[PDB]
């Protein structure tokens, strides 16, 4: 375990010692041949020449050797241990600001090409999952995330935000109540499956709740005769084809601090639908016409990518 | 990451400097000194004799000592995790005119006798399959099929032609569809099952269709009874015992380019009968009367391995 | 296999002679410049000047250079074969105090909270059990725990205890009657699943028996209505809220070797219900009032944890 | 691949040339002078002191350690390539007198204690047989035994006999009829699972049938009411508690060769009863008064481990 | 369960399951229902062949050890598989007949060598059996009674004179 330090230290105060009180040359001398002997440099200033010395010098260099081909041995175990246990998992999280996707489905993936790569950490069980999450450019965490004991592994406590996704609600729901019980101020993002759940899941304790089945299912029985919401929805929100939803922040100052929609007047100025401003945390879908905007707002609306350029230019100062 | 180069010149530049400015030696001469002293060859012909360079060789081994020790600890933990991570597929293929068999199957292992043995890259998801891969002789892609984002790991843009043959007809025309989405001009040979499937196949942009399981179901409805179309198709097609089909190109001049085929007249006078020329990527089987051979043809005949020999040479020139 | 030191031997007792019926220096001196040259370090004190040594000095070093290179590779392939080996199991226990814990459930991860993590050796055969013990901080032995021939690689002859926990009562009983074949002292400690096997668990050779399924079963139907001593089991013998069930044992002297229970008076004294005492491998629950206190009694009763320190005074001498 | 020869040979015959054609001494002073640098030697006899040859000592040596930084790298991915190669089988036999078996059961485990450790090579399929095999002590060699293309990689064409034991009756069929295709002459021994399969194992060229089920069921119908043969067939032929089923050879001479039973009387002088003798893989069970032994023959008795000492020095000579 | 099929009061109780721990459990719950009924069981591995006697069976049939210990026997020499296979398992042409020598029969009080029992009918007297104890190789100073069981090796022609000989 430790014994390499000691045994180097050994050899090197053995070969010392050996030098000085045979060839009766200074410590400082003494010190040198060893420590350039035990290294294969072999100046060969201070050779040997008494016959006792001259054997003495083979019994040092096979103990260097020995030295040698037990450190050697050593490192490359610990190297080969490592490099078969991070690989499978195993491991623990030692970043401050990564982000935690428990469970591992098709909606993660999409959640991967808008981040970065070596700054998530999925966070599952299954097998297959580890090599899906190595192709995607991200990093395995090997654990359960239902057991408490595991997301502390991936350190939950220290992250930005996670992700929950799992394969069922109850596995969510005990996930987010697990995590709820390590760090109360971690922003959590769960995806309810069953329209039952959505009450569940904001009372145990997630900030959002996304609900991509009950979106469908109501999109597909009113799609029937006609489909025009559904169109909307698509064109907007999944592929961005010709608009886009966008939230823009006002800063500070901004040319409009204080003035009231009636009076700023977005849509006929810029040509942006807005359909509410996020004022602290609630939104106020279609703000009257006396709200009066402020600074760290976050309008919401919908336009052409030109448009919303025309807008980002219009809220500066 | 990148330090091994840092600390190698840091060392080096650290050397010199305090061979020059202690011992009093050139530039030229310290440089060698370092570079005979970090490599552990020791000339002797520069050792230091002032007793604080005799103390300063023995940092600057143990220097190159620790530099020694994590470059090889970093060569050895990349070049194991690439043989880790290259063993279980995970790899991007680099070639230019290699065949991709997407999928693996039975009707795939016999395709492997007539091609090379690095030059197939097998797309497939399954374990056993890489196995049964390494046995056969090619290279295991680790991969979905079916995803594009996997179809370019196989490099499916710039191969040579692409074998489809996955576990039902829902998989061959979705691998079939995202294979026409990355290179339109590749050749894909497909392996219908189903016998409504082949016009689908067809559509969705594969090249040839081929279809074991009609055939085989063709020839064991009408093999009850008697069952001579079933022995012509065998000890043809499959074991080439006696006879065989083979296509014989023609080249430039051929000593019969513009004859017809009654003055050639290749059955009478070879032995090896004419079943149809291939003229330009359409078949005309049992060409008339009028036909006039060209450059380029490719005649398609039945015969014994001697009258294919004596074929190829009555229209060569 | 053995012949590394064939070869160092023999490449050591040919340099020897080399040098010394070649430039005629003493054997002394010959031995000492083989093991100066075979390990690279080169004093270059008795270079050889003649023309035939100055070439045989080559085929020396070459020769030394093979040895290296086949010793390290030798080195290297014991060091893989030992680390993946160790790593899936396939290894022999050699410590004379372990506690060996067939097979793995949740009622087995609980009794690893109270004990050493490297002083535990599981004993199972399933694939997700070894990754689940390694991340407990236990070591896994893979065998099956019902095979007399692998019973024995885990060294349950030299064990303190044995804890038995398996998917079944079958496989249970059959592991039992193994351990009780290989030795007949170790202490065994099996979980009954069902109520008609603790019998059989007991005449199979199991000094003690515990039976959670038994004790859940019978508190569930019994807390229907009010629900009381489901309350007393749960908050002393699960949580230990704020009650304890501890055994206080009663050492040499002890101020009250041979006193009565009457006497004594340890409830109103100290505050600790007096359960009963185990006298000798065996539980006298409620001691009569004319019992007598001895040496190596161990005291059983509930208490707080300031009562249980109020009593561990009370007892000592 | 092959280029560290080339990189070896092309830095030495730079070395040679650069020191022969720059410090101007001869070739062989040359050609030693790089051979004892290359290897970081350093005898410091012919230090290059032109500042010329000063500055080339150091490419000459940065090459050397890039030559040693590839040659390692290469030996190192080989070695692990190999070693992670053969540990999961995919290695072919290149033994010449083994023992072959494929498939593996627990009637395969009993035929493992009366054979050597490394003497055989367990032919199977699946993944938990690979470590029941690492544990009993033979080699593994994965592949399909139903493949003639995988009986070859057990060198099936030169073993000694082969043990056919698979998961049913259709595989033992097809794997004796693929070894009876490779070596007309290898001794197969299978393992008939129904009867109605014997015939067909003794039609496909099996050399012994052994069918357990058959005996199992057959003495499990006739053991109900008193049991009898059930307990000679089991203590003779599964535990040999107090007798032994022994085949003794007669040798030449021994003193017994042309005798008849009748005047050799080997029940009332020896006690071991003769069931029969094996004239040439024939079995004449309960020979008649007439027969006359031989040279060669075999003499099947049942005898206690006592008799049968008794036995053996009765027929040697 | 075992409650349901009438395992008290049958004949025999034959316990062949999917595995070795299920048998030794069957066995240790037929003895706590029953502890007369007759139990057969077989044994998987060789080493729970103690286990399955001491757990109560009266008859313990290990048919996957007798092939393990004839698959290591036959690799060269391959004579006592011949043997097994033509007797024992297909019976070919000699079969092991077991025949009970009723009362006053030609044999109550006479011993083996005036017996004669090979030679006037041809088969191979294995061993006799008196009370659950098979007597291998019965010693010459031994007598009949009427209710041992005689063992013999035998083609179908024989074993009909020997009980016929054997028939007051
Ligand atoms: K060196
Ligand atoms: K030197």
Redesign the interface.
């Known amino acids: 375990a430790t014994r390499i330090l000691l045994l180097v230290l050994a050899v090197i105060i053995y070969g010392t010692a050996g030098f000085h009180f045979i060839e009766g040359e200074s410590w400082?001398?003494s010190?040198?041949w060893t420590?350039?002997?035990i290294?294969?440099?072999?100046?060969?200033?201070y050779?040997p020449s008494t016959?006792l010395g001259?054997?003495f010098?083979?019994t040092l260099?096979?103990l260097?050797?020995g030295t040698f081909?037990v450190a050697v041995?050593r490192?490359?175990?610990f190297?080969?241990?490592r490099?078969?246990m991070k690989?499978?998992?195993?491991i623990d999280v030692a970043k401050s600001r990564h982000v935690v996707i428990c469970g591992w489905s098709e909606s993660t993936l999409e959640c991967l090409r808008e981040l970065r790569g070596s700054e998530v950490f999925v966070l599952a069980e299954d097998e297959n999952v580890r090599?899906k999450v190595?192709?995607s450019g991200a990093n395995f965490v090997?654990?359960d995330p239902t057991r408490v004991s595991?997301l502390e592994k991936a350190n939950v406590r220290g992250a930005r935000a996670v992700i929950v996704d799992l394969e069922s609600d109850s596995e969510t729901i005990h996930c987010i109540l697990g995590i709820r019980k390590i760090d109360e101020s971690v922003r959590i993002i769960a995806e309810a499956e069953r329209y039952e759940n959505i009450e569940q899941l904001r009372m145990a304790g997630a900030d959002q709740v996304i609900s991509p089945f009950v979106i469908s299912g109501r999109l597909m029985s009113r799609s029937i005769d006609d489909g025009y919401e559904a169109m909307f929805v698509q064109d907007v929100l999944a592929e961005e084809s010709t608009r886009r939803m966008v939230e823009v922040p006002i800063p500070e100052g901004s040319k409009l601090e204080g003035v009231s929609v009636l009076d700023a007047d977005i849509h006929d100025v810029t040509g942006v639908i807005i359909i509410g401003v996020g004022r602290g945390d609630e939104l106020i879908i279609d703000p009257p016409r006396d709200y009066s905007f402020r600074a760290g707002d976050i309008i919401l609306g919908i336009g052409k990518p030109e448009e919303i350029e025309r807008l980002k230019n219009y809220i500066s100062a």
């Open positions: 400082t001398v010190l040198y420590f350039v002997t290294a294969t440099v072999g100046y060969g200033d050779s016959p001259m054997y010098t083979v260099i096979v260097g050797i081909a041995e490192l490359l175990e190297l080969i241990n490099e078969q690989l499978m998992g195993l090599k190595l192709r090997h654990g595991d």
